[PDB]
Write a protein that binds this ligand. Structure first.
Ligand SMILES: Nc1nc2c(ncn2[C@@H]2O[C@@H]3COP(=O)(O)O[C@H]4[C@@H](O)[C@H](n5cnc6c(N)ncnc65)O[C@@H]4COP(=O)(O)O[C@H]3[C@H]2O)c(=O)[nH]1
Ligand SMILES: Nc1nc2c(ncn2[C@@H]2O[C@@H]3COP(=O)(O)O[C@H]4[C@@H](O)[C@H](n5cnc6c(N)ncnc65)O[C@@H]4COP(=O)(O)O[C@H]3[C@H]2O)c(=O)[nH]1
Ligand SMILES: Nc1nc2c(ncn2[C@@H]2O[C@@H]3COP(=O)(O)O[C@H]4[C@@H](O)[C@H](n5cnc6c(N)ncnc65)O[C@@H]4COP(=O)(O)O[C@H]3[C@H]2O)c(=O)[nH]1
Ligand SMILES: Nc1nc2c(ncn2[C@@H]2O[C@@H]3COP(=O)(O)O[C@H]4[C@@H](O)[C@H](n5cnc6c(N)ncnc65)O[C@@H]4COP(=O)(O)O[C@H]3[C@H]2O)c(=O)[nH]1
Lengths: 344, 344, 344, 344
């Protein structure tokens, strides 16, 4: 047996790299296998996403090809993140209102996945991570692969996508009318949903895969040019005895360390678990650390055509290179995954 | 076979409840079993801790009884959190320097565990969760239960204890001279180390327990009167359109939502995993929620005499009741755990 | 055989959570079982209520669906607790006259249950708790499931609902013309009618169920977001030597402690009784403690839009979660309860 | 087999009537049976008390005769309620500090039972009711008749007696050092512990009495001249629309109505349950209503020698009258109850 999981991280604009890599991968399969109408979502038994990766995960699960999702991203990339609002991010605007607007994101997501499709209408298993601000617990939107799951069978995908992409300071929290709860970005809990995806197969998807073990689970994780955050040695050495304004400038250093360490933590337990089982090859991670000079330019919410070119170029480059070398990456697209038929 | 794990959460001054419950548990075993000189750390194969729970974890691992640690806690509680610094938590002080000081905490830990004991001298396995601010990854101090471990064999316990208790704003980051790195509180990654404790037995603790499975693992997670943080519904309804002043009042609401959701998540994977194999009884959690009026009084760093009595009273109360009803709690102290000898 | 009991607590506006949970339960049964025109009151052989839970109990007993009562409550919630009077809860008003008015509550119940239905017309057994102020003994309004019971046969249902909701300080005592006696809130003797509901089946309902024992009795107690009241440790430590103004500020602390202790006691007798017979699973209690920040806003009489959203959101979320996990909750709706025919 | 339970209510100085009735009954047994040194505590398998009834319950459980306690109560009654107090019970005094003092009560109780006696040393089963002000839940002090619990074995009886007699407005809350919790009068929870005594036998005392049913249980409840409380019809009719100052004059009319209705409710379940099994003769209640003219004179804190004579006279005449008529009363003292041996 074999279970394939596709995991997308959250990277805001950097999700363009995630979708460009998948779009380039789709073209390679079409050319090499002499196939047509190749959808990258047909090769995975479960698709997990977070933040901008959640929106792409819902689109792939809905039935749209990565190439179609790729085109909608570039057109709406400059609309989700307007240049005027991107330039104006001073402290007075930061402490008065949330940066950017939610309507352009709503219109962008509406174009890709739609506005009326619900989780019970999906033929592909999905999981979208989110944080329930009203309660404080993390809420995970997912298709009813568990027959007893009746909480979000009638929740529109556009609500889950908009909830998981509501960055605490980059967008206002998303209000879901069907649940009467406000939600925040899913990156506050699992910015890398690779680990929790394996947990779902061994816990929730026990009806389609009764004899499921981590040995028979292959994870294809597509990063968003992850940047390992850390406090500058000069800042730590000289300002460790200061508070807030100098060290932990406002909430910035405390939150960024919290997400980065938590993201590192969940990545570690995945690596440790596969190491102990001698199945480290099952976790196929496709990511590339962005250089220092490009880091100052390619930010979380930079939609300039110069930065858009670099992300598209990196996605095409990694897709071609990793397909040539990583044999396990090629084994992912050897056979189409069975469609998810909900059990009633 | 049986493997027993003790997990202690981090809550600053509320750790008095954690140690009072263990101290009360020690006296109960002495009276009912008619034995003398009973140490609560002799019944566990691994002790995990975080923040104040980490400091108590090192005390039990070293060989000091919970009653001795409890006595040192009350005397040092006022010194760790002086009333002069506690009342002066205004913004013009928090924006300039971190409140409280590390020296009073250093002496409290020194009288608790010692000053020259190193991880290679311990006869009991232990975790200490921490965040490496210099690198951004979480750093876990632990005894060499894995024979290939050479990083903390020559690290003093007092350095690990001060690293895990270095709250981002309540204390300055702890600088370990032997590692040349600055460390922060371990509650940023795992306020409840119960889940990561189970992972240790199946991953690194294989030299002593080769056939280790979650079925043969019993966890005694002692709470710290955990408070389920959430955004006020009036605030969310009225201030969702604002940013960083009304909603997310400075960084406070972002961090608390992040840690609580992460702490909720790790407990959720913990509960979901045990429920999968129908061994939910293996996880024993001893914790209760603080009433609304008391929660306003019992804060993270309140060392008032009235608050100390409530924490001590709650620990004595819960220990007696849970021992009577929870048979699984009584099964922990049926046999002493074998001493851990490092492999050379 | 099997006897099913529904018990509802009194929480003022928090009863919206009680009816929202019941309303969403009705939709789940309709969606999963493909049924139509489902009523949550047709699956219970006895319905017990108190205060705002008594009004909902009377509505379900007559034959109204939980969804209709939910819609009626939302429209009238603002009317019952006007913002002008809610904000004007100062000391001169409280010392001169009762807060709020009875006529808006009278109209709300009138549009919810009617104004002419009497206890002899009901086809479902119900019991409503109240306090007879004229005599001092607790008076219980109930349908004549006992053939010898002729006291409430010819009394309107709205009078019982009006009587049980007459909070001592939030409403004026309700005067029943047919009985010539004044009545107060039913929460003074039983805020949780779960225990007294079991006694009724074994004492009064002996004709329909001759061989009735607690093993065949299942109770579905729907909470009202109960809060565990206690005196703050700072108040107890510093003001135990004072009187009234400081400790027991007027009658507030005495009445709250007496009501909370009595409510805790009756629940304790239920848990002790069931655990002695190894039938603890028969008591299905669906309740959740409010977080400290939310508990400040969500009070007994706050009808603001933000608070109403949270109560509705919690009910929707709780109903979905417990239905998936708790198998005993699902077993309640496996078969409709037999209609109650008053024997003559 | 038969199980005999003695239950004593709480009425302050009215407990002198309870002890006088108990002391007189000893004299009749001595005269009729021609025996020497008869203690009524040896004829009961469980003794339950509340407030002043709890203090007498502990004295009987220790092994002291009722006559000895009657002599001690007579001299100490004036000191417990000094005539300097009870005459200056002005509103400002009550608005500032609690009336009376605990030290005269503490010294009085010490002469009754002692100071070093503990529950584990008792040879008779006892159960004392109290409410934990720190937690809000009722706390019941009892001997270890069920060996599986260990909380009160090392608590002095004088602490339980002080806790259960701590009237919220007549005495300051009692602080127990061994538990770090404040306590109040048990009359708030159960002023008549007759009902909870039956549940204690059928739940906790399953070791000595495994096959225990309510049929084989006889209860001898000795009241303290209980007076039913009801709001005056003139006040109710005229001040129904008023608040506090007129209707519910401060907390008085709310606490009293809540207290008397809860006491009525608990007695009602005892009556209703016994009628169901047709064992109404088992509940032998010895109490009479105080005439109206002396009702205003004989209060719960009146230490005048005239009221003491009336209480002594009522107890002396009730014991003689009931013994001749009530055959079931005589059957209580037919055989001595087996001593309580705490199983270890
Ligand atoms: N997400 C979800 N939950 C549902 C659904 N129908 C019923 N439920 C129930 O609601 C509970 C809470 O859902 P949540 O997503 O808000 O919280 C979740 C989420 O925060 C987390 N979680 C779920 N799956 C996870 C996973 N695979 N990895 C890591 N964390 C996970 O654990 C919580 C408890 O999961 P659970 O399966 O024991 O309980 C569910 C589950 O029993 C449904 O359609 N979706
Ligand atoms: N903690 C530790 N690590 C040691 C020691 N000697 C060598 N090492 C090595 O250093 C690596 C990083 O240590 P860390 O504790 O800073 O990061 C750790 C810690 O952040 C996390 N981790 C470790 N055990 C964990 C656990 N049980 N649960 C959750 N996370 C855990 O994963 C990281 C990688 O663990 P690993 O065992 O694969 O690699 C170790 C391990 O191979 C040693 O004495 N202690
Ligand atoms: N409630 C009620 N009582 C009736 C009716 N017709 C005749 N009665 C009689 O009037 C008595 C006083 O009614 P109450 O409800 O005001 O007091 C009740 C009520 O305060 C309480 N009670 C009744 N059922 C209870 C129950 N199931 N659980 C707890 N307490 C209960 O005990 C009191 C006396 O019990 P009871 O039912 O034997 O006495 C009834 C009963 O014998 C009638 O239609 N309703
Ligand atoms: N009463 C008591 N309980 C003890 C002791 N040692 C351990 N415990 C445990 O602590 C729990 C709570 O004690 P509490 O007396 O403060 O609350 C008690 C008390 O408030 C109430 N209660 C106990 N016995 C009762 C009874 N017979 N009738 C009515 N209410 C009763 O119910 C609560 C829960 O009782 P429980 O037996 O299930 O759990 C006990 C019991 O398991 C002990 O010495 N006494």
């Amino acid at each position: 047996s074999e279970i394939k999981i596709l995991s997308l991280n959250g990277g805001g604009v950097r999700g363009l790299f995630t979708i460009t890599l998948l779009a380039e991968l789709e073209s390679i399969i079409e050319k090499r296998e002499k196939c047509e109408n190749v959808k990258i979502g047909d090769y995975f038994d479960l698709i997990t996403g977070t933040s901008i990766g959640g929106i792409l995960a819902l689109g792939l699960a809905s039935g749209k090809s990565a190439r179609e999702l790729k085109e909608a991203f570039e057109i709406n990339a400059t609309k989700i993140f307007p240049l005027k609002r991107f330039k104006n991010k001073q402290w007075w605007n930061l402490l008065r209102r949330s940066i950017y607007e939610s309507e352009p994101l709503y219109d962008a997501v509406k174009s890709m996945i739609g506005e009326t499709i619900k989780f019970e209408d999906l033929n592909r298993r999905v999981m979208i991570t989110s944080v329930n601000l009203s309660t404080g617990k993390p809420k995970f939107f997912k298709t009813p692969h568990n027959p007893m799951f009746t909480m979000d069978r009638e929740i529109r995908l556009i609500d889950a996508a908009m909830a998981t992409s509501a960055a605490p300071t980059y967008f206002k929290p998303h209000y879901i009318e069907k649940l009467e709860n406000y939600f925040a970005d899913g990156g506050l809990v699992a910015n890398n949903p690779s680990y929790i995806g394996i947990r779902e197969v061994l816990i929730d998807m026990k009806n389609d895969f009764p004899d499921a073990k981590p040995e028979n689970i292959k994870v294809l994780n597509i990063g968003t040019l992850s940047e390992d955050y850390c406090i500058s040695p000069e800042t730590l050495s000289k300002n460790s005895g200061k508070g807030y304004l100098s060290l932990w400038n406002m909430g910035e250093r405390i939150v960024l360390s919290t997400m980065t360490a938590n993201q590192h933590l969940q990545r570690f337990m995945l690596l440790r678990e596969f190491e102990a089982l001698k199945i480290e090859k099952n976790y196929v991670e496709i990511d590339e650390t962005i250089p220092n000079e490009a880091a100052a330019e390619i930010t979380l919410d930079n939609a300039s055509e110069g930065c858009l070119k670099a992300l598209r170029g990196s996605g095409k480059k990694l897709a071609a290179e990793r397909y040539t070398k990583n044999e396990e990456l090629r084994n992912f697209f050897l056979k189409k995954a069975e469609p998810f038929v909900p059990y009633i």
